[PDB]
C-alpha cells in the first residue's frame, strides 16, 4: 500500500506474484516492477523529479 514509512523494501521480481506463477520473465498476467525513470524535460512540466 505504497509502503510504510520505515519499510526499506528493496525486493525485486514481482510484488507477491499473485495467482499467476513466474513463467520465465513475467508470463501472462505479470510484469517486472522497478522500472527506470527515463523522464524527459518536456514530457510533463510538473511530472519530473
Amino acid at each position: 500500500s505504497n509502503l510504510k514509512p520505515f519499510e526499506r523494501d528493496i525486493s525485486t521480481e514481482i510484488y507477491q506474484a499473485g495467482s499467476t506463477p513466474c513463467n520465465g520473465v513475467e508470463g501472462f498476467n505479470c510484469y517486472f516492477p522497478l522500472q527506470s525513470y527515463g523522464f524527459q524535460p518536456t514530457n510533463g512540466v510538473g511530472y519530473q523529479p
Partner: nanobody
Amino acid sequence: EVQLVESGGGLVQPGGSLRLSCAASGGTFSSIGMGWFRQAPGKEREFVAAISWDGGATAYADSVKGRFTISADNSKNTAYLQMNSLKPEDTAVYYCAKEDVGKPFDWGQGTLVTVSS
C-alpha cells in the same frame, strides 16, 4: 463474450516485416495482464511479447528483443505489433489476450502468419 478482432496476418518472405493489429471490444477498459502468445505447429503455446495498459511500457521475451515492437493506445483501444527480420521458425499463429481484473483469461481467434519464400 469478450470478442477479439485480429488482422494483418499473412504470408511474408523470410526476413520480411508485417504489421499486426489486434483490437478489443472494450473489455471493461481496465486490464493489467495482456500479452502475445503463439502456437507453433506441434508445439505448446509459449510467450512472445506483452505490453502494459497502465503506461507506455514495453516487454519482450529473450528471443524477440529489439526486433519486435509493440505499441498501444487508449483512444483507439488496440495494440499494434511490428515485426522485423522474421525467421522461418517464427511461422506460428499469434494470439492476443486480455486478462480482466479478478477474472480468468480471455482469448481471441488469432491469425496465421507464414514465413516462407
